[PDB]
Symmetry: C3
Subunit: 329 residues, 3 copies
Amino acid sequence: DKPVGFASVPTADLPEGTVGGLGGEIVFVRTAEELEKYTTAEGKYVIVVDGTIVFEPKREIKVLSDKTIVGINDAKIVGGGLVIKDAQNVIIRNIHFEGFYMEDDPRGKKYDFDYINVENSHHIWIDHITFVNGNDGAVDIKKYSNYITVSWNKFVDHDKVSLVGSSDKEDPEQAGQAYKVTYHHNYFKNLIQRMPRIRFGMAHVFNNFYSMGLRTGVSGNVFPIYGVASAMGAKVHVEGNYFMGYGAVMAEAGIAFLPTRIMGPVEGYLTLGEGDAKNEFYYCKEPEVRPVEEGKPALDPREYYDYTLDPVQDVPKIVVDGAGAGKLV
Amino acid sequence: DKPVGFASVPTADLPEGTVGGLGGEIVFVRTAEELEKYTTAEGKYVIVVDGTIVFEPKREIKVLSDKTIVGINDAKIVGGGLVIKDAQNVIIRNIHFEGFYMEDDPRGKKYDFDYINVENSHHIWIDHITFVNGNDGAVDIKKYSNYITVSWNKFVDHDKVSLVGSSDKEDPEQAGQAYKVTYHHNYFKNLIQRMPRIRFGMAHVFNNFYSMGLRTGVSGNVFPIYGVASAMGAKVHVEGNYFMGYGAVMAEAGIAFLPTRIMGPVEGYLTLGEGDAKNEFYYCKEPEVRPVEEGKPALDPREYYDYTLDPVQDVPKIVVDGAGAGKLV
Amino acid sequence: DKPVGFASVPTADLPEGTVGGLGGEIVFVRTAEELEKYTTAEGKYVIVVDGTIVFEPKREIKVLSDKTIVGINDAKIVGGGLVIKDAQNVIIRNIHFEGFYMEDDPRGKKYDFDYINVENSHHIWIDHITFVNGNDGAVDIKKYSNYITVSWNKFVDHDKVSLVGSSDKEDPEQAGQAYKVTYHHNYFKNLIQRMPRIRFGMAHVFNNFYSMGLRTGVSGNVFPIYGVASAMGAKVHVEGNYFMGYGAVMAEAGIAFLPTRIMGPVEGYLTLGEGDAKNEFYYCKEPEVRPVEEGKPALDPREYYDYTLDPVQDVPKIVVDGAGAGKLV
Ligand SMILES: O=C(O)C1=C[C@H](O)[C@@H](O)[C@@H](O[C@@H]2[C@H](O)[C@@H](O)[C@@H](O[C@@H]3[C@H](O)[C@@H](O)[C@@H](O)O[C@@H]3C(=O)O)O[C@@H]2C(=O)O)O1
Ligand SMILES: O=C(O)C1=C[C@H](O)[C@@H](O)[C@@H](O[C@@H]2[C@H](O)[C@@H](O)[C@@H](O[C@@H]3[C@H](O)[C@@H](O)[C@@H](O)O[C@@H]3C(=O)O)O[C@@H]2C(=O)O)O1
Ligand SMILES: O=C(O)C1=C[C@H](O)[C@@H](O)[C@@H](O[C@@H]2[C@H](O)[C@@H](O)[C@@H](O[C@@H]3[C@H](O)[C@@H](O)[C@@H](O)O[C@@H]3C(=O)O)O[C@@H]2C(=O)O)O1
């Protein structure tokens, strides 16, 4: 009912952090035209997606401020995505996104279809969504967006999962102050990269289940490459996550998922939880780390918000049981 | 109608070897409660499983001596397994086991669910069963069990297939005299390990078809590792089996299924058939062998029972055509 | 409506090149017996396959000269193939072949079932067909066959795709003058080898989409090995084709699809298009080449027929949208 993490952080005009269209007008939508009518409307709306909505032609629609998009009756958006642009205060929950896969574009480099594309927007909660094999990104977060929680989603069979900050060339000061994102209790399943890949900002990645089997049926990237990456001086803390790679034969040949990655050209920072906050890694390469200061978590999310960490051994069952669309009441 | 191999070996009270509930009372079961009522009953029963039986919650049920559990009408046990404990003389045939896979436990190390778990039991025939992707073991054989035939089953998409002897620390004399198991005419399909893995005892592995493709859709072990393993001084003979691994590209990179494996800490023994009893290996590593004495089969099953060996080139078609549930009349 | 490439080349008795049963008698067939009645009939026939035709037992049927075999209503030939032998002037279009896979023969070396087997025949057009995981070949071209176009087909999940010339021991002069084959606008999807593999003759391979993901569910060859191969002094030109292999992890371990291959024992020749006729390669090894003469295309198809080359970047979408059965009107 309320987000945990960066989406919950209060501002002047959003005293309770992200609340979407709370207090607004309730509308049920059953077609792409109806959905787009209300996501592009001005004002508070709770937009209830009832069942399957097919976008033909495939396309993305804009979403303005103060919206809740909530699915019921196994809500599906098929061949459609949401661009949240120059906006704030949007909640998206309990919908299954599928149908952006373009078999003529197996590396997701032509069509640019993202299921959720957040551009210069802040206070956004993406929760209890299932995303299945899209084209380009599943949830991308760009152009100085900020204060995002991506929680309890299930991402399946998808290559480039979540890019946070799309350009090495953005303003170091401004970008360093944006891109504050929390990823927690997500079920990441047979995915390839960017979970998240973050430039500049701050990422708290906790209590997610990474179940990295192969992406079959397709060409392009069949084997999972890496989970979390920290680039362009980002501050990332990764704790209490459970990583399972793709097995003993491959690991013995020196081929294995990389749980955390430092990337450049200006290296990011990233630390791991330890002790009660440790991650677990099975069939993985050794995680890459780079602290801001020896013995300190590169990010202290307790400076920004409260949260409780589940013991890592409990994470698989909690995440399988709870994550993705069709589980919320 | 009668087992071949170690299940058929006569004792004082079992003059015809394994016969299950022959002569006993015939009962049809259509629920988990009814099945458990009769598998835990004292006395002779022929228990006919008619159609699908779902176990919610998932769980294993005990089976006592002198039972036949036989499926009809595409019998399925879903999310349930059978523990045959401190017992003897049990036949299980023509049932499809599925539904023990636990996606929060991709290495099968938490829940401990076995489709068939044989503990301190002997004279057990497991025949014409299909087992699909369980949790821990498909057919495990533990705690000094003995005189088992596992024949004409189809095992599919499963990681840890059949463990025979669960502890390096069992009594060398006692364990050396137990765990006499014959595995024949099984269709082993996209499986990872232990086909069987045996400690201490004696394993005759003949005329099985190993079709080792990838286990997809899952994390953990995606690539088949090894077929038969002989550990703790076990005596294993492997003859007339057809092994097909997962292809030229992998084999050329030095990555390939290992058909037979010697394991420790006290090394087992294992020999191959040759000439008319040879195995065939395609896309495999060279099999590991270790004879008890130069030029002798580490086990001579003709000292214990009669059998006829199919020519290895005939094994794929015979096994595909005949193995698994839903083929017996 | 008319072939492009070698099938269109005029002869004395075939002034318009391949036209199949144009002008002949139209017949609708709905059973394997009816189909075989007409493919083995003498004379001109347009044979319209309406819906699914199942061959039990699985088998191949002969097709004589001057035939059009054309599917409607999602036409399927299941467990059947066509042998075009000592014949000419045959068109096959808009049918889905499936059901030759033999799981007891994962390397396709026992049963010898080909979906289309062209023997000592010429002027054959194979167009808008979908072929799914057969046994041995999908389209083999043998025994001095000649003047073939294989265009706009979709080949899926199949190991040994198209062998052109089955013997190193055929007559160098005669074979050098036969096996003139054009492969264009085919969607090659999760296939293993021979796309085509050609001995002796001349192959023009243009504007095909190679989407080389894994062949899962099966043992044998799970990883795609190589696309086009030129053997026994064949003359092959490969231009405007788009190759996508199976990803970064494998490529970084030195494991990757080989787009073009020179094979012996007498090496073939093969050249690539460049500039406006270039191919694209992603996640592939470097293509093998061997020109007849420095700076010349090993084959100049403009000496034999006219064609227009699509820009390679357009090929994936054109081929996905247009290739395979069920798309022709
Ligand atoms: O079911 C078990 O958890 C189990 C039962 C065994 O009796 C015990 O020895 C132990 O199995 C080990 C290992 O822990 C298990 O993970 C598995 O390892 C295989 C393979 O044998 C290894 O060489 C390596 O490649 O890792 C593999 C893997 O599955 O990750 O099996 C061994 C074994 O002894 O058989 O756990
Ligand atoms: O259909 C056949 O059985 C067949 C037809 C060929 O004309 C003949 O040369 C021969 O094919 C060989 C080989 O036997 C076959 O197995 C296959 O090999 C590939 C690959 O080319 C090899 O480099 C190696 O990687 O193994 C592969 C494999 O499939 O296991 O194809 C070659 C060939 O010449 O093309 O059999
Ligand atoms: O969506 C994109 O096209 C894209 C967005 C990134 O912000 C940009 O840096 C760039 O991504 C590169 C690379 O081009 C892309 O292909 C991918 O590469 C991965 C992996 O990171 C590499 O180490 C290598 O293994 O190749 C992989 C692959 O997917 O082929 O991602 C990198 C990146 O920076 O994250 O394109």
